[PDB]
Design a protein around this ligand. Sequence first.
Ligand SMILES: N#Cc1cnn2c(Nc3ccc4c(c3)CCC(=O)N4)cc(N3CCC[C@H]3CC(=O)O)nc12
Ligand SMILES: [Cl-]
Length: 122
Amino acid sequence: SQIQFTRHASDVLLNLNRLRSRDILTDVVIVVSREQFRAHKTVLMACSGLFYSIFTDQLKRNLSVINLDPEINPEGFNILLDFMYTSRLNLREGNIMAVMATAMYLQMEHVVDTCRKFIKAS
Ligand SMILES: N#Cc1cnn2c(Nc3ccc4c(c3)CCC(=O)N4)cc(N3CCC[C@H]3CC(=O)O)nc12
Ligand SMILES: [Cl-]
């Protein structure tokens, strides 16, 4: 039975976000209407059913650009991408509906569950 390091996973994630912030080894650009966001495909797959289903497929494995659905709110996507890399979700009454629709599209069931609880507690 192995020694558990309770802070390790959070430390790795912090460093993955630092790599994203310095554009180190990012391998995809997500185009959301007039905005673009660079990221690591590995993190996108790890956090989203949509990105998992795209990049596990050898047909799409090597794509360097992904164009999201035209109606996806870029603010909602930006908040979710930050969530992926930080474990912190920037939810408020002013963005709840946009964040919820985007998380349903991205297939992020725990975030959708949290959005539903935010509405229930409102
Ligand atoms: N190699 C690999 C690899 C990389 N990413 N990834 C994911 N990503 C994934 C897929 C879907 C969702 C989310 C993440 C976020 C929440 C959501 O609504 N959907 C899942 C996964 N597995 C393997 C067993 C079943 C599943 C995990 C499980 O459902 O218990 N394998 C991998
Ligand atoms: Cl989730």
